[PDB]
Swiss-Prot record:
Capsid vertex-specific component that plays a role during viral DNA encapsidation, assuring correct genome cleavage and presumably stabilizing capsids that contain full-length viral genomes. Participates in the interaction between the capsid and the tegument through interaction with the large tegument protein/LTP. May mediate the capsid docking to the nuclear pore allowing entry of the viral genome into the host nucleus through binding to host nucleoporins NUP214. It is found in: Virion; Host nucleus. GO terms for cellular component: host cell; host cell nucleus; viral capsid. Heterodimerizes with CVC1. Interacts with major capsid protein/MCP and triplex capsid protein 1/TRX1 at the pentamer vertices. Interacts with the large tegument protein/LTP. Interacts with host NUP214; this interaction might be essential to the capsid docking to the host nuclear pore. Interacts with host TMEM250. It comes from Human herpesvirus 1 (strain 17) (HHV-1). One of its GO terms (biological process) is symbiont entry into host cell. Belongs to the herpesviridae CVC2 protein family. This is Capsid vertex component 2. Disulfide bonds: none annotated. The keyword Phosphoprotein does not apply. Keywords: Capsid protein, Host nucleus, Host-virus interaction, Viral genome packaging, Viral penetration into host nucleus, Viral release from host cell, Virion, Virus entry into host cell.
Length: 410
């Protein structure tokens, strides 16, 4: 059972074994331009992370090949796995993913505000764009400062998860997404703070669309609620980044050239207008997100879109010696988890790994909030920004989001 997905309408589907970016890396490094007077590069951002990884965790040199100042395949593999791990929930017994919860919440919000009726979870995934547009309209772009952040003063400092299923009272309540879901009857009122659930529409929808016979009371599993609000926030950002994208622009303006990367393995269709709506997103949901979800219903947003994680991390600043504002220092969390991934490939206390993973999840969340707050995060208004990630076209953006990088033979 091989996986097959389609990232962009004009391109051929992509068939592979288990993890798309990892498999693609195997292909680009087994190819021509990956040796001799030619090498595989991924952009300045990735160069900075690799340099920083070598400097701060020298032992990684014993697990990867950094000769000729080239970009290491083992390094990029560990890095993509870390990006994919950003939004993963390892600790905690649960029967639903943050992604499934996010889909059910968006569905309910749409039903409660806006509104052929969806019958399966699959139906819901297909209609994600309209739910996302609804969320966007409901939130608004006025009032000034939609707050996509929690009350950090009320949340743990070095752990992501809520110890016993609950964070300090009011820790989550103020995030715009959560306040919106409560305002519109999707999420019940928060538990009180003073010494089965027929009124929980989310649990009900979960029962109906997934029928797993397990209760889903988000206020009782607040780690999952926090992850759910983050996933919703991330989907809104993806929708924004892909809005009105022209994936048919001049092919020669794409940093990504599948033809050069995998030599050989490679109109009149009223696809739509150039100033597309959420058409590309619509297609992604149907031909990328859905097939991946069915193959693995526990999958989370960052696993689907490691590129989104990278953009989010790049947006945050990190957590008489030195005031380091360098990209490398800002990504210290990413670097550490990546280095740990690398070094273990050669038995790091699971607790140390959990600590490193939690610190990254925390910075991802912080960066995601900053990105969600920005008025203009589109490719146009951030050309140099995306350039550091080897993205220059809307075509590139789509692949970047799913892969976590854009390879090019240099």
């Amino acid at each position: 059972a091989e996986m097959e997905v389609q990232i962009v309408r004009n391109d051929p589907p992509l068939r592979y074994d288990t993890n798309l970016p990892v498999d693609l890396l195997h292909m680009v490094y087994a190819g021509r331009g990956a040796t001799g007077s030619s090498g595989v590069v991924f952009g300045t951002w990735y160069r900075t992370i690799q340099d920083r990884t070598i400097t701060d965790f020298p032992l990684t040199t014993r697990s990867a090949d950094f000769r000729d100042g080239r970009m290491s395949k083992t390094f990029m593999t560990a890095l993509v796995l870390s990006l994919q791990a950003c939004g993963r929930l390892y600790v905690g017994q649960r029967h639903y993913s943050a992604f499934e919860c996010a889909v059910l919440c968006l569905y309910l919000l749409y039903r409660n505000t806006h509104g052929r009726a969806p019958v399966t979870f699959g139906d819901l995934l297909g209609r994600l764009p309209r739910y996302l547009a609804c969320l966007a309209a409901v939130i608004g772009t006025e009032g000034g400062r939609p707050q996509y952040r929690y009350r950090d003063d009320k949340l743990p400092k070095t752990q992501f998860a809520a110890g016993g299923g609950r964070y300090e009272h009011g820790a989550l309540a103020s995030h715009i997404v959560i306040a919106t879901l409560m305002h519109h009857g999707v999420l019940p009122a928060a538990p009180g703070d003073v010494p089965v659930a027929h009124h929980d529409d989310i649990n009900r929808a979960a029962a109906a669309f997934l029928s797993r016979g397990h209760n889903l009371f988000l206020w009782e599993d607040q780690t999952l609620l926090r992850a759910t609000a983050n996933t919703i926030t991330a989907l809104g950002v993806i929708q924004r980044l892909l809005a009105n994208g022209n994936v048919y622009a001049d092919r020669l303006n794409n940093r990504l050239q599948l033809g050069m990367l995998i030599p050989g393995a490679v109109s009149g269709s009223d696809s739509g207008a150039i100033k597309s709506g959420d058409n590309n997103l619509e297609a992604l949901c149907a031909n990328y997100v859905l097939p991946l979800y069915r193959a693995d219903p526990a999958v989370e947003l960052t696993q689907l879109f490691p590129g989104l994680a990278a953009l989010c991390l790049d947006a945050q600043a990190g957590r008489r010696r030195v005031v380091d504002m360098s990209s490398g220092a800002r990504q210290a969390a990413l670097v550490r988890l990546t280095a740990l991934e690398l070094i273990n490939r050669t038995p790091t206390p699971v607790g140390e790994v959990i600590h490193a993973h939690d610190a990254l999840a925390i910075q991802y969340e912080q960066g995601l909030g900053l990105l969600a707050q920005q008025a203009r995060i589109g490719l146009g208004s951030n050309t140099k920004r995306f350039s550091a990630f080897n993205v220059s076209s809307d075509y590139d953006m789509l692949y970047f989001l799913c892969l976590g990088f854009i390879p090019q033979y240099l």
